[PDB]
Each structure stands twice: as structure tokens, then as C-alpha cells.
Write a protein that binds this ligand. Structure first.
Ligand SMILES: Nc1ncnc2c1ncn2[C@@H]1O[C@H](COP(=O)(O)OP(=O)(O)OP(O)(O)=S)[C@@H](O)[C@H]1O
Ligand SMILES: Nc1ncnc2c1ncn2[C@@H]1O[C@H](COP(=O)(O)OP(=O)(O)OP(O)(O)=S)[C@@H](O)[C@H]1O
Ligand SMILES: [Mg+2]
Ligand SMILES: [Mg+2]
Lengths: 362, 362
């Protein structure tokens, strides 16, 4: 008779979600307490009732079905670092089309739960797991970069995603990589978040300086990356000097051969972020691994004008021009974050913002 | 009565494949979720239904057969680092020819699944395992090397494979090795992939700087390498200085005696790749271990001409000559990867490619 055993690998989440959502008559429940991010930032705790071992029964269209958890917890391993957490579906039939159907429905509901939000994955051992809960999509119009830099990057990445046949009919690998660099507090990580929210993509964070990251495990992680997901390497310069400086068993050649080597996977987009670009070996930022280097730097006239128009909507452009001129006359280099803080002091008080410029001259 | 116990060693894969393919009436299934690389790069997730413990039955020609998995998971070891994963075939006969027949059929189907693709193996402990899924065979006409370098290597390796009797009638060992060296971004790994795809061979990656690689384990791995497979050592210079610099318990003499020693195996082809050749000890690149050193270097006139003809098919040769002349006049040394990126900017716009050459002068 029909029987299915998920095995707890890159599928467990979706089936748990469906189990909770559809049944509504189940017993042997549990308590999963977590945070929920309501509108207006006022978080509140929330309970999800999820299975616990013993026999659970569900009536979905057609025949009765018996689902179950078989957690005979012998877990001497890091493969889960928790009980093995099997699951079981079964039913008194021998036409296994309906089981395939229910699982695909679970996939559909899972991918539909995140409609206007941004998932963040993370590395658990050598697999990708959800991390926390869906975040709020930071709009892309609220990250003011230099004149004609966000449009360039967005256009290039869109062109990359909507021309896969041009890469195959010439034998090139279907990969790409980007590198944002510049001083501290200038718009790298925020732009990455906004870009991920504009392309309906997700994010997958990867911390090289981590105690459980061998070259083989890294080569396996980037190959099993979720579909339609940006991978991200934050501060890749702090990992190497052509010599490792972190806790772990990762080398330089392993990284260089995992990004672009002989057994690298297709349809992958990697971002890197660094503050200092002189400490990066030229064998890691050459074309093939990193096809677009961009410098997100200190503010200029246009940036300050646009930031002023963002914070105080409903003012004449003359006031914004006055602000930009005064600030850029006062101090030579000023990052957008300092300007953000300065506006954070004067909420809904544009005149006071234009009057108290002299507090920025360090 | 007839009974067989695979023992989970260099055979498990093929029997699992046959179990899935032929039965179609099995129960106690499972869920193996993975990626599938359709045409046009648009990957999609995919499910394979594979066995799970309990009794499975199959009707293959002749007599009924009872197959089974006996996973009584006690796994305190790295020999599998997972449950022991036995398998069992059995049948009410005493003529053990048919079992041999079914296993050979499984081997046939397994070797036939990969028809126009390239397998990549990897090192799991001290055995070779499949890694991911079959890749797409990069054509050899899309890797433009110097004038008469790919033909030379391909001809030498073909002559090696099609004259095994000349090596035995003179007592020489039936081994060979190659070494590609040169600057970064000049065509080493890509050429290795193309060459493996042209000879219907496979690839077996080996990372020396790995935490679980003793000299004995290495001597055992290269002896149990799959049939018709290139072995590959990427960045062999970063492992030694005549002193180890990696995580592991590997030495120099162990490597030198594993490649060519007293207990080295026959019918083996090894590739090495390095950027710096001066840091290699002359006792590792002398003849016997490495019989052909080649320098894949910066571009020249002919390379640029051929690359232009590859990217923009259907243009007059005059335009390609103009491009090559202008680029080689602009900058002294330019690698093929920079040229690839420059063409990646101007898609299907040859005139713009010939006009915007000056953007390469650094
Ligand atoms: N162009 C910009 N427009 C709006 N806010 C910006 C801009 N650039 C930076 N910021 C502000 O910078 C803050 C954080 O930006 P980040 O991208 O994290 O800076 P950063 O480069 O990561 O600095 P480090 O090195 O990580 S401490 C946020 O509060 C943003 O509001
Ligand atoms: N002769 C060539 N023809 C076409 N593409 C080439 C050629 N040489 C290099 N490339 C490009 O180089 C890229 C990677 O080639 P690789 O062989 O990996 O370079 P590499 O020598 O491995 O550099 P490192 O040291 O590993 S960063 C691919 O995108 C190729 O298109
Ligand atoms: Mg940051
Ligand atoms: Mg390489």
C-alpha cells in the first residue's frame, strides 16, 4: 500500500506546513512558540500546533490517509544534531499519483505563503534551512546611490536572468558574480536587500569564517542552493591575508575552485561585499568569478538632495538644494548614514534641519 | 536459496538505480528531492522514489524475487557516517546465474544513463562517489588555445589510450601525467573539462589540502579510481612550500610515492594545474610523473581573431582582424577572460564591440 518517508532533507518544511494547514482535526499536537512581525513593528508571540509522535489521520480528497511521526530518537551525529525526525504518509491504495499530487500542493502553498516578503536562508551543516521568519521588503526607491548605479546593476542582472539560451549556444557557464566595495556606511548591504526584494529573489547567507566549513562542504553547499536565490559573502577579505585566518578547515584554492572551477553549478548569482579592495587577491576578483565591480562611496550633491526629498516629502526643491549645498560646504566627506542620523534627530522639522547644519563639522 | 548483500561499496548506486527503474509497483517508497538541469538552464526540483526498509517485491523474468533494505542503524563510524545502509536480494532458487545477470543489467543501465554528459566524482572517505548530477559537455571548439596546443595534447592522450601493448612488451608502467601552467584566466580548467568531454571520459576531483587525507588513504584512493576517468589535482603548489601547509596528515614523500612509486596502479591519467611553476619541487614535475608540461598563456593575434569569430558568427573576417589588431595595440597582455567579459557587455552588437576597444587600456 502507498507509503512515503520524507527522510528529513530539503522537503520536511513544506510537508510540515501542509500538515498544519489542511488538517484542523489533528491530535497529538505540539507547541511551537515564535515571534510574529505584525504591521507597525509591534511584534507578538505566536503559537503553531505541529505534529508529535503517534498516529495522526487526515481526510483529504479521495481516500482516508494515515500520517505519522516516527521519532525513535537515536541521534549520535551532526547530520541533524537533534532527533532524526522522520515522517510517514500512508494509505490503502496502490495508485501513487495522488501522493505526488498532495506533495506538489504542499510545495505550491509553501511558495505562496511568502507573497510580498523576503526569505533568508542559512547554512545548517551542509544544507540550507529557513532562518527566522519572512522579513519586510525594503523598497528600492529608499536606497539612494550615485547617479546611475542602481539602474545599471539592476539592468545587468535582469539581462542575465532573461537570456539563458545565449549562454548555452556558446558553451559559457551560466554563472555571474558581483562585487560591491567602498567605505563604511555607504549602502552595500541595504542595496543588496533592496535588489533581492525587487527581483522576487531570496537570500542565502554564507559565513566563510565558520568552524564547520571544509572545502568539500562548501563545494556541496553552493551546488544545492535554492532556486531563484542570491548567495552572499559578507567581508570576504577578512578570511584570507593566500592563508586562512579563521576557525575552520577552509583553504584559498578550495574557495576559488568552488566559485568557478570544474564542478561548479549553473544558474547561480553570488554577491560579495568588502570595505578594503587592496587586500583581495587578483585571482578572486578577475573576470569569470566577478564580472562587475562597483564603488559605493561617499555622498555627493545629488545624493543629499534626493535623501532630503525622501525624508521630508512635501517641500520645495529650493530647500533641499540649500541643505545639500550647506552640508557639502561644511564637511568634505560625509556618508549617507551620518545624514540619516542627523535627520533622525529632527523628525518632521525641515527648517530645523536646514538651520542646524553646523553640528556636522567634526 | 539465492541471497545477495551489496554491503554498500562501489555498487550500491547501480542497484538502487535499477530498483527504481524496473519495479514501478513498489511500496515502502521514499522521497529524494534534488535539482534537475533542463535544457536552457531553467533548473527545477525533482523527486525520485527510492526504497525504505521493510519488504519489497519485484517480478523480473523467471521467478518472483524479494528485495529488501535492512537498515538497523548502528553507525558509530566514519566508514559511512550515516546508517550502514545494507540491501538484500533473495529468491527461491539455487541457480545463481540469474542474479549475476540482473546485476550486470543494472551496470549496463547505469553506464547508459550518462550518454551525452560528463560525470564528476568526489572523495567520500576513501571511496569515490557521484557528486551532484551529470553536467553538460562543454564543446571543445569553444575553448580557443594557442595555435596547435589542443591538437597536440588530444593526440598524445589518444595515442596513449590506443597503444597499451607497447607499454607492456617493454616493462614500462602504464601511467601518464600532464601539467598545465600559466597566469590566471587563460584556459586551464575549461580545457580540462572540454578534453574530458571529448574522450568520453569522466573526472575525479581530489583536494590535497583536506582534513581526512593521510598518505595511505591517498594511496588507496588513486588505486580504486573509476575506469575511464581522469584524475585532477587543482593547485598542487598550495599544498607544499618539502613541508605541508594544509589541514591533514599528508606528507611530500607520500604524494610522490602515490603518484609514481612501487605500489602505483595501471591505466591512470592524472592532470595537475598550477599558476606558479617555480614553487614546485623538481622531484614532482620530472618525467615519469609528469610527461608533458604546457603553458597556457596570455592572448595573441590568432586567439583574439578566433574568439571574435566564435562570439559573433556571420561576420566578414576583416572585422575580426580589425578587432584583434586594435586590442593587441591597446594593451600589452590581455587574458581571454577579460575579452569574454568585454563581449558579454556588447551582446549581438559587433560594431559596438569594434568601436569601444579603448575601454580596455587600464
Ligand atoms: N544610499 C543610501 N541611502 C539611504 N541610506 C543609506 C545609504 N547608504 C547607506 N545608508 C544607510 O546605511 C545604513 C547601513 O547601510 P550598510 O549598507 O549596512 O552600510 P555598510 O556598508 O554595511 O557598513 P558596514 O561596513 O557594514 S558597518 C542604513 O541605516 C542605511 O539607511
Ligand atoms: N582560450 C579560451 N577560450 C575561451 N574562454 C577562455 C579561454 N581561456 C580562458 N577562458 C575563460 O576563462 C574562464 C575560466 O577559465 P579557467 O580555466 O577557470 O581560468 P583559470 O586558469 O582556472 O583561472 P584561475 O586561476 O582558476 S582564477 C571561462 O569563463 C572561460 O570562458
Ligand atoms: Mg554591511
Ligand atoms: Mg581553474
Amino acid at each position: 500500500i502507498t507509503l512515503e518517508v520524507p527522510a528529513r532533507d530539503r522537503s520536511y518544511a513544506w510537508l510540515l506546513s501542509w500538515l498544519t494547514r489542511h488538517s484542523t482535526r489533528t491530535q497529538h499536537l505540539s507547541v511551537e512558540t515564535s515571534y510574529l512581525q505584525h504591521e507597525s513593528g509591534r511584534i507578538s508571540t505566536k503559537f503553531e500546533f505541529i505534529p508529535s509522535p503517534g498516529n495522526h489521520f487526515i481526510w483529504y480528497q479521495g481516500k482516508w490517509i494515515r500520517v505519522e511521526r516516527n521519532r525513535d530518537m537515536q541521534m549520535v551525529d551532526l547530520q541533524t544534531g537533534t532527533p532524526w525526525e522522520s515522517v510517514t504518509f500512508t494509505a490503502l491504495g496502490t495508485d501513487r499519483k495522488v501522493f505526488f499530487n498532495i506533495l506538489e500542493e504542499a510545495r505550491a502553498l509553501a511558495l505562496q505563503q511568502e507573497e510580498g516578503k523576503t526569505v533568508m536562508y542559512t547554512a545548517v551543516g551542509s544544507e540550507w534551512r529557513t532562518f527566522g521568519y519572512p522579513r519586510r521588503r525594503r523598497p528600492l526607491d529608499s536606497v539612494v546611490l550615485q547617479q546611475g548605479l542602481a539602474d545599471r546593476i539592476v539592468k545587468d542582472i535582469r539581462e542575465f536572468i532573461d537570456n539563458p539560451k545565449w549562454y548555452i549556444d556558446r558553451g559559457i557557464p551560466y554563472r555571474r558574480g558581483y562585487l560591491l566595495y567602498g567605505p563604511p556606511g555607504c549602502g552595500k548591504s541595504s542595496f543588496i536587500t533592496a535588489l533581492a526584494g525587487e527581483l522576487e529573489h531570496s537570500i542565502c547567507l554564507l559565513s566563510l569564517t565558520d568552524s564547520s566549513l571544509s572545502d568539500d562542504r562548501l563545494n556541496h553547499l553552493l551546488s544545492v542552493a535554492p532556486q531563484q536565490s542570491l548567495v552572499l559573502l559578507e567581508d570576504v577579505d577578512a578570511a584570507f591575508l593566500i592563508k586562512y585566518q579563521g576557525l575552520g578547515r577552509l583553504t584559498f584554492s578550495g574557495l576559488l575552485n568552488a566559485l568557478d572551477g570544474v564542478a561548479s553549478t549553473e544558474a547561480r548569482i553570488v554577491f560579495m561585499t568588502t570595505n578594503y579592495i587592496d587586500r583581495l587577491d587578483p585571482a578572486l576578483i578577475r573576470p569569470g568569478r566577478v564580472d562587475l565591480k562597483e564603488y559605493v562611496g561617499y555622498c555627493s550633491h545629488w545624493q543629499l538632495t534626493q535623501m532630503f526629498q525622501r525624508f521630508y516629502p512635501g517641500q520645495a526643491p529650493s530647500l533641499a538644494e540649500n541643505f545639500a549645498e550647506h552640508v557639502l560646504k561644511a564637511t568634505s566627506e560625509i556618508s549617507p548614514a551620518q545624514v540619516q542620523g542627523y535627520f533622525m534627530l529632527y523628525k518632521n522639522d525641515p527648517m530645523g534641519a536646514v538651520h542646524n547644519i553646523e553640528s556636522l563639522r567634526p
